[PDB]
Design a protein around this nucleic acid. Structure first.
Lengths: 69, 115, 217, 111, 79
RNA sequence: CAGCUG
């Protein structure tokens, strides 16, 4: 359905790896937030919206346009 | 200069200012002791017969040098208490809203472009 | 020989000594930031410190529409559209909070005052912010761009069809009838073009100021 | 120094329901750091805001313009602007409907 | 640590997670339809496995395990 | 009432 579920896996992995040592924020809150982000809106849409969510996730990983320190 | 009854061009995600109609909202009142308005001045604005408080962010009148000079008189919708109504402002806002003391930070929490 | 037009003084009766002070001081500001040659059509990116912020730079890009003013306070105003809003910023050339002003695209538009981009379609005032600086041939005349723009509906912010403006970069006959011609050409004023005494003989002052600018070593 | 670390320590000992930070890259002109915090109720926001602002006032930063508690009149959404930091206290539902950190991350990528 | 050690740790983690109810707790407790799990939820589950034993599961085999016997085998042979 | 007008 999406560009690739493997890309979703990799970006989720990177986000959560940087979330394991997320010092300034809250781990439980970030877990709830990432769940609400990447689960509800990444399940049953057309491939266009799949790619939009994928781009949202890769940006949310990147941190250039606002990093979650 | 955004006086009384200038046709305002709201810029907010809130549908209050996006309900299409030939009545583009016109300012009712300005809380500066003079009736001229400038950047970040609380005004009373009329939208579809509903009065509301609004924030001037960008206008067509050439102000100080290192602030922008927009095309039409942009405003932001703010509820009576102070919570801004919208959550995404498509057009950009000047930085100059931050300078003086006052109720102006809570609308800085929406700008995608601090131009 | 090009002299930035904010070095040639307005005709008047202020005495030279002020102009000498202005010229020496603005030249001795040029040595901390080169102000590149730029014209009333060129495109520029400006980078300015934000005293509003905690010492972080703020960038902008747009087309310069007016080169206005003389002396240490002269300014240039550049227009650009973003998200449908046409924002113009007037930047003071010699301000202590302009780091670098670089010519993204040197080009000299047909007119001498591009104030009518407020009343042309946004396509002529659109520029992607992150565009890359086009190179230029060093030892040849600057480009003379001619994009005779297309106009919005009639009620313009001024009345540019008037001939005292002498605008040449607007399409009239494409969207104008001859009726506008024969009603707006009673205010044409032939005599003023040949008034033999309004003309500012700004040559001798040019030589003197070139000597002075040379001698800043 | 009244940096972010002492602030989050005060929040943790006061045990706000949530704390989080977002960084402002130097190519954005707004501020240096954006601390989204959320306490229990308006009284709790009032008390923690008063404690943090009083500690800031007394400890250091006397030679600069003072700090105003934005939106104390409004019982759901508060803000405070420091020289480099800015902190925002949120009601739960107000925080959800606004979702500021999303924009701070997706500045030009999502509505 | 030990084979029984990793087995009981895996069982304890599987019990710990809330969305899955440990009705069957063998090494053959299927994931997708029996316990109602999706691919992203599979990555969440294997992350939950990492946090106490593992921590270095790459992104190549995260959507085929299909049973906690494979979880145990992965933890056993990865060391 | 749409918008222009010292």
């Amino acid at each position: 359905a999406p560009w690739s579920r493997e890309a979703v896996l990799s970006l989720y992995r990177a986000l959560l790896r940087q979330g394991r040592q997320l010092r300034y924020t809250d781990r439980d809150f970030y877990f709830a937030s990432i769940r609400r982000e990447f689960r509800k809106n990444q399940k049953l849409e057309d491939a266009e919206a799949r790619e939009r969510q994928l781009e949202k996730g890769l940006v949310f990983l990147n941190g250039k346009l606002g990093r979650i320190i | 200069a955004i006086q009384k009854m200038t046709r305002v061009r709201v810029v907010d995600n809130s549908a209050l200012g996006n309900s299409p109609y030939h009545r583009a909202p016109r300012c009712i009142h300005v809380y500066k002791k003079n009736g001229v308005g400038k950047v970040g001045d609380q005004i009373l604005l009329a939208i579809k017969g509903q009065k509301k408080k609004a924030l001037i962010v960008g206008h067509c009148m050439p102000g100080p040098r290192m602030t922008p000079r927009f095309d039409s008189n942009n405003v932001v919708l703010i509820e009576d208490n102070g919570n801004p109504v919208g959550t995404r402002i498509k057009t950009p806002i000047p930085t100059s809203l931050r300078k003086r003391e006052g109720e102006y930070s809570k609308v800085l929490a929406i700008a995608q472009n601090f131009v | 020989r090009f002299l930035s037009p904010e070095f040639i003084p307005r005709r008047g009766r202020t005495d030279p000594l002020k102009f000498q002070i202005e010229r020496k001081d603005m030249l001795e500001r040029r040595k901390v930031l080169h102000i590149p040659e730029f014209y009333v059509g060129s495109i520029l990116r400006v980078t300015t410190a934000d005293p509003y912020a905690s010492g972080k730079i703020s960038q902008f890009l747009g087309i310069c529409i007016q080169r206005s003013g003389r002396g240490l306070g002269a300014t240039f105003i550049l227009r650009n559209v973003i998200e449908g809003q046409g924002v113009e910023i007037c930047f003071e050339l010699y301000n202590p909070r302009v780091q670098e002003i670089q010519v993204v695209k040197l080009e000299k538009r047909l007119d001498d005052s591009l104030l009518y981009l407020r009343d042309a379609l946004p396509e002529y005032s659109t520029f992607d912010v992150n565009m890359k600086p086009v190179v230029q041939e060093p030892n040849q005349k600057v480009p003379v761009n001619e994009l005779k723009v297309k106009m919005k509906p009639k009620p313009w912010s001024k009345r540019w069809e008037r001939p005292n403006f002498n605008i040449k970069g607007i399409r009239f006959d494409l969207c104008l009838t001859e009726q506008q011609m024969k009603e707006a050409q009673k205010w044409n004023q032939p005599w003023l073009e040949f008034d033999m005494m309004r003309e500012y003989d700004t040559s001798k002052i040019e030589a003197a100021i070139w000597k002075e600018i040379e001698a800043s070593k | 120094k009244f940096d972010i670390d002492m602030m989050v320590s005060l929040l943790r000992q006061e045990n706000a329901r949530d704390i989080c930070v977002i960084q402002v890259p130097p190519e954005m002109r707004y501020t240096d750091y954006f601390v989204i915090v959320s306490g229990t109720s308006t009284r709790h926001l009032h008390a923690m805001a008063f404690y943090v602002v009083k500690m800031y006032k007394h400890l250091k930063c006397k030679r600069d313009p003072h700090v105003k508690i934005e939106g104390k009149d409004t019982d759901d959404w508060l803000c405070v602007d420091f020289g480099s930091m800015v902190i925002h206290l949120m009601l739960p539902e107000t925080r959800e409907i606004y979702e500021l950190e999303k924009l701070w991350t997706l500045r030009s990528y999502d509505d | 640590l030990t084979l029984e050690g990793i087995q009981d740790r895996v069982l304890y983690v599987l019990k710990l997670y809330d969305k899955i109810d440990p009705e069957k707790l063998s090494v053959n407790s299927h994931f997708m339809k029996d316990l109602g799990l999706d691919s992203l939820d599979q990555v969440e589950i294997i992350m939950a496995m990492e946090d106490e034993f593992g921590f270095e599961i790459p992104d190549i085999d995260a959507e085929k395990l299909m049973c906690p016997q494979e979880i145990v085998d992965y933890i056993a042979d990865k060391k």
